[PDB]
Amino acid sequence: ASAAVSVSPATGLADGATVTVSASGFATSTSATALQCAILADGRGACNVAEFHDFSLSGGEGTTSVVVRRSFTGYVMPDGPEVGAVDCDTAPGGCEIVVGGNTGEYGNAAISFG
């Protein structure tokens, strides 16, 4: 693997919960974010802009606490129009947390409700 990624707790989640994402090992990447998006039938990148963090690496690690609500106002590209309130549980693929630098790295990790 290019870099080790792991989430703990990651199963039996409900509304009002807060996870603890982790990351270790770097070489290509010089920064790191922790964005989340809802896949639909058309596959457009519907991602929320208010749940972001964006900050440099401390040396080669960068832990951060992200919130996971049952519903949120999605945003499709800087042009719009806005979609509005859409549920994550009704979609086929469902929500997936993605971690990666500004270069082109990726490392997906799915979750599961009780």
Side-chain angles (χ1 to χ4, degrees):
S2 186
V5 202
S6 34
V7 195
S8 34
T11 62
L13 309 184
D15 181 79
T18 284
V19 286
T20 285
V21 164
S22 95
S24 270
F26 83 111
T28 36
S29 52
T30 325
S31 37
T33 329
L35 282 148
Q36 66 206 112
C37 308
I39 318 314
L40 312 159
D42 42 80
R44 289 266 167 133
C47 325
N48 188 81
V49 277
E51 278 164 76
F52 92 115
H53 276 80
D54 183 77
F55 75 113
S56 87
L57 288 151
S58 189
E61 311 196 279
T63 318
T64 153
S65 279
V66 161
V67 205
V68 270
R69 284 270 165 119
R70 184 52 160 161
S71 273
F72 42 86
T73 286
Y75 220 99
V76 164
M77 257 65 193
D79 286 85
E82 204 192 272
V83 270
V86 71
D87 265 74
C88 173
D89 286 84
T90 39
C95 298
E96 270 165 83
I97 323 313
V98 195
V99 194
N102 67 285
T103 38
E105 282 267 86
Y106 61 100
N108 65 283
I111 46 148
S112 33
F113 317 104

